[PDB]
Symmetry: D4
Subunit: 219 residues, 8 copies
């Protein structure tokens, strides 16, 4: 378990991270974390590692791109003095290109995305114990569907950044891809983005595996 006793873990991202969390503070055991993967992660950490006393904060905001993250980074991340920061962003940066193809100011293209994401990591890194970069995803098994193919470009950039900055790394697309050998997307998400509890459990599990959670502790 990478995360130590008494440390503060902060999640940031878009609607997938937000999932109705309390604004602004995003912190608490009784519903403030929202109803998705972040809450599940916290639940599993308290169920299996209750004695760690890890404080968890949810700073997800629905609709955000990486441009949006940068605009609130000082208040929502730096000022919280976290020990660990998890980032999942990119879905909207890409989705806008495809759902509102002529509203170009809503789009964040790959080279802006890469430099902005890198800027967040590099600002943050000297201030925390660690960073977890989670790729964006698209719940679509055809690698050549245009949005899937784009998403994969963004996920490859995240991986490159994590390698270069010695951050932890969660490939969410790879997690979905395993399940998509069996299920058509619509069984997880009608819209291919916002999933069922199952999808959120896919995400929470992928995150926990990368931080060295054990389902039943050797300890």
């Amino acid at each position: 378990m990478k995360i130590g006793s008494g440390e503060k873990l902060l999640f940031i991202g878009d609607s997938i991270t937000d999932c109705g969390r309390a604004r602004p503070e995003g912190e608490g055991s009784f519903g403030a974390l929202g109803t998705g993967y972040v809450a599940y992660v916290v639940g599993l950490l308290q169920a299996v590692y209750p004695e760690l006393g890890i404080r968890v904060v949810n700073k997800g905001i629905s609709g955000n791109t990486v441009r949006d993250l940068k605009a609130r980074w000082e208040e929502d991340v730096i000022a919280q003095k976290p020990d660990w920061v998890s980032i999942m962003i990119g879905i909207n940066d890409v989705w806008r290109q495809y759902d509102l193809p002529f509203m170009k100011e809503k789009h964040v293209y790959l080279d802006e995305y890469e430099a902005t994401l890198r800027s967040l990591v590099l600002e943050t890194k000297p201030l925390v114990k660690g960073i977890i970069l989670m790729t964006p995803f698209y719940i679509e098994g055809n690698e050549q569907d245009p949005m899937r193919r784009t998403m994969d470009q963004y996920g490859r950039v995240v991986k490159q950044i994590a390698e270069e900055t010695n951050s932890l790394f969660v490939d969410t697309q790879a997690a979905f891809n395993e399940v998509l050998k069996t299920l058509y997307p619509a069984a997880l998400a009608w819209d291919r983005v916002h999933p069922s509890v199952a999808g959120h459990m896919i995400l929470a599990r992928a995150f926990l595996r990368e931080i060295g959670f054990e389902w039943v502790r050797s300890r």
Copy 2:
């Protein structure tokens, strides 16, 4: 125009037809028709052929398969004594196979679909002046996406029942396919099924074209 003065035109189908129509009656100029293609059809007929005096009833019900249509056919179609019946059914018959793959009782497989749709068309045809069979559709441009491929098969059944029964036929998939040469599905429908006003306009236009509507009357 195939449809003539004083005739009662009754539309039946699933959510795409329903669009929040008034239940049970589904009839009237002031919101009873719902907010999608059926209303748009009636509006355009009224704007361009006000003198036709067509009465239009919306018997769409969200969620329905053709098995559900059969269960209400007597009270919602035959008892309304329509002159013209327009049917668009099949989306849910297919979609349940993909979004609830393990709840097999909710699926209506091709054998049940064909037999049932066929039976409804045959029973109805001698009772009315005319039938219009509209294909189901899936807003997805890849013919080898599994659900698109299934939907195309269901739509071949509809085409061949229309041909056999000398019913009018509207190929709604082909109408979307044209726009899909330009737009990614998400620009019309996040979930590839329930579209924007533009999608309902694609549907209304396809219907009207098949019934010989003229945008500006030749006269």
Copy 3:
């Protein structure tokens, strides 16, 4: 088609233009345009000309007169940098004279209306590709009903302005008048102002015809 690829078309007016559009921005494919003629225009443009990529903004506000338009023109029109501006105003300028005949400050009489409308057109014209002036209307077929007779005076002023300024011109009253050879007003609008889908389709069609939309493209 007068409107070119990539251009921004902005509609302004009263409740007939507003129809519940999102405030303040009024822009988007999924409901921000409201539920009336503006949305229908956009729907038909995307259904038939998806590749044009025309951005459309709805700046209608319920209750407005031309005095009101002038008060928000800089923020709601100039600052949007549109390529095309469509204006429909006058209904309230006139209606107040008849529904609140003793609340005179709510009235905008014809000579103020004419000069104010002209001022908007002349301010705007050097900044855009084109202007579309749509007359106000009253859904009443008796030319000598007092409100109808007044409305027609205002529509004649709009026509004169469009001719003088080389704007495009939509005679909405003439569009209604054709339909009113068959229908009593109440079949379109109980209040003779706010119509059914059919009325909105009358308007959308009238607008599209003036910009050279084709229902089925020669192209």
Copy 4:
């Protein structure tokens, strides 16, 4: 005053009568009567003739035609054992001909109107102390507007049934016509049917005048 001490006065009709009255009972001093002319009548009677002890019941139902009155007459009129019955019906009988011209089953044409109203009056008359027939009306000053012209015909039927049955008679059209020499319809009722408090006062005053109310008692 035609109406005397301890008598039960029952009003029946459509929305103009209903005005949100309590269902099913329609009786009582504290809001059960609704918010229009029936309540205003009861208030004025109470203010000026408190000692009369008149009981008043509102059996108005929004949307009704005379065909609807007949269907509920037994339970809503005869079973209430009133002394005096006031009827105002006909607006919807007419209005449906004009606002839903093609839904002919919703229309109640003059033959059905006369026969039915006549039958109700004849059946009721021997069971009660008195009947008051109030004309329907249309807030429109042009006698040749098609709906006004129809409404005037229906009102001639009412007048002649009242004369034949020696019922009291209230010419509500004539009461509006007087105000319409000054006001355009929209100042009283946007839709020419459901008026402001002023319109309900015109109705209440016309009723009271016919029953011999005095604003200040001669005594």
Copy 5:
């Protein structure tokens, strides 16, 4: 009729005047006047004197005493430039003494009430055509019930002020007292203050009589 053509009549007071009027403006034919005596007055004036074109504004605020009136007098009265001002205040000034007898700051005793009311009249008088002073009231027929006896003291002060300032005068208590020879208070108002439509009609009639309204005009 004291009130002339084109003049502005403004009502001010407490909840009895307010009756849910629109804030802040309190002016309009379609519900802004609230649902009580003020609206009824306007209704009767439009029904019988439509050609007068009298503008009416409702500045009632629930809970107010005369202290409260003075605090908003410049914005709610002076700044409206009325021709006629009607005042009804005192009910709360008195009621608080009896319902919250130990919350003394809510009480306005008679000598403060008299001087404050006089100050409003004297400030206003040089700016208007006329003032109408309506007494407060308490719907209680025992002159020796403590609250009734107090209320009567306040009404006598209003009468004295009206005489001294040559204002018009409405004795609302005397109007109620006539009806209370027949009805127990609870038939008009459970709380002895907020009445039925009948009570509001008592008030509206009392006001109209003092301004020389005729129910049927000699004119």
Copy 6:
């Protein structure tokens, strides 16, 4: 204490008893009892005699007269098998005579009141361990107010049925009369019937005193 360990105490009456109790059951510690004197009684019993283990059911129904109690007596009283029944009824029996003086069917005059209450008490008495008859009341200190005077008569009937049947008796009027030497009615109840928490405490205290509650147990 008259009431003993393990006994079921059932309260019945009108709004004063109901106070928003859960329907149909009316039983339980956590809000089912409503928010007035019945709940206050149960709370005080629990605070001071927790060991008594009294079960308490609230069968109050807003609006009821004794005629309504009779109509539900079998299912709401006898079928509950109580040990002790507390009745407080009469307010509405009286109040309808005064607030709806002309709706005579809603009145329950003294002959019906006495006969009915008497019959209920006689039928119930052999089936239970004990009955407590609480007078109705009117929060009004003037014995010659007409409704107070009637209520006092109804309360004499209750007292004399209690004496005859050796039932416990609570004179609720006398409990209010004591406070009314100090407070005007409006300080307890604007409408002289439905009081503040203080009024419900006056009722609860009167009940408890009659059943031999001690505020601090003598032990």
Copy 7:
């Protein structure tokens, strides 16, 4: 009775004091006091000592610790110029330690609690007639349950402060403890903090006993 005629008694605390009181003022006979012990105290004082005319203000705020009280003390206590101040605080100071054991900034430990509480008392004492210190409580009968054991430490500090400052003292825990010889906590409060009416009556009674209330006055 310690509290004299005309004096102002102010309660402050957490949710147990707040119980939905009106913000900000917290004062009035008709619901502003909330629905718990404070209201009950006022009810009993008005039922038994109506002539005292004691004004009572509720300044409870849900969630508060003693740190929170100190932050609003000047506006919510000093500025009200009370004669008597009752304080009940500590429940949250303790509860947070146990429900959110890793959100340490929400905790108020005993030595901070003691000094802060003392500071409030000492600031206040020269400005009032008297202070009533009510212990916090936990509805749990096992003295060695960790939260109960902590709560008792805080209650002992309150007692010490009251002794040192010559304040009045209410041991709420001792009151509960008597009832907990019979009832399991859940019969009073599922959460062991927020009780039924019974629990609130326990509190109100404990408070009244300490101020020398008599249930039936010797006087």
Copy 8:
């Protein structure tokens, strides 16, 4: 994994099972399962064993005891034809003894509990592929708290019915007891029964462990 491909797993119990599941059906991927352990189980199965194709139905109903389960067993369990039935019941059977100690009909004492649960298990076992008996629980670490001690006894009954019937068994108390070595109950559940997401994760994990789930499959 004990549970195999294509099998229908039906969960039944009280609120802890229900968690807002869809009624009556309780089945489906998109929210029908509710928001607690049942949904979490289904999500984890889907994330880790998507190919198993397990159908899962939630028949939990808030408030139920085993007496309630028996009353609906035919329609909610047997008629669903499940392969696997998971039962968790007993919380309410116990809790009513403690929170409503005097409403003895609501209690289900150990004799009724054992007999009834036993009978259900015996009747069901020959009709299905397997049964999983989950203990009730109480989030309380003191074995001598009276309700914890009772709950432990009920849980011994469940264990011994499971052993006798060769049913799978989940000791949910033991799973909470482990976390309770660290956390006070209030950190998981204020009321010691309805827990946070962490509590539902403790339950889901205990279930999954008993059915041989692997967090990462050995393969």
